[PDB]
Amino acid sequence: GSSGSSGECEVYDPNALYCICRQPHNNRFMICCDRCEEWFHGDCVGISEARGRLLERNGEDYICPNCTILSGPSSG
Ligand SMILES: [Zn+2]
Ligand SMILES: [Zn+2]
């Protein structure tokens, strides 16, 4: 049977999971990874509010842990 529900969008929706902790975007600090290109919470991924803030202004490429944890740096 025809299935599809494309209506209003919000964070409240519990079905919306981003961070690895399976939690909605809350006040918690969030950053945009480059490896997995996913949304996570600083505290969760360790990255502190400040640690990330700089990565922006400075111009550094943040790399969540869950990513590196898998494999080391480039070049195997
Ligand atoms: Zn989280
Ligand atoms: Zn990542």
Swiss-Prot record:
A zinc finger (PHD-type) spans 16-70. Ubiquitous. Expressed at intermediate levels. Induction: Up-regulated during apoptosis. It is found in: Cytoplasm; Nucleus; Cytoplasm, Cytoskeleton, Spindle. It comes from the Eukaryota. Transmembrane segments: none annotated. The PHD-type zinc finger forms an aromatic cage around H3K4me3. Required for early embryonic stem cell development. Putative transcription factor, weakly pro-apoptotic when overexpressed. Interacts specifically (via PHD-type zinc finger) with histone H3 that is trimethylated at 'Lys-4' (H3K4me3), histone phosphorylation at 'Thr-3' or 'Thr-6' disrupts this binding and promotes translocation of DIDO1 from chromatin to the mitotic spindle during mitosis. This is Death-inducer obliterator 1. It comes from Mus musculus (Mouse). The chain holds residues 257 to 319 of 2256 of the full protein.
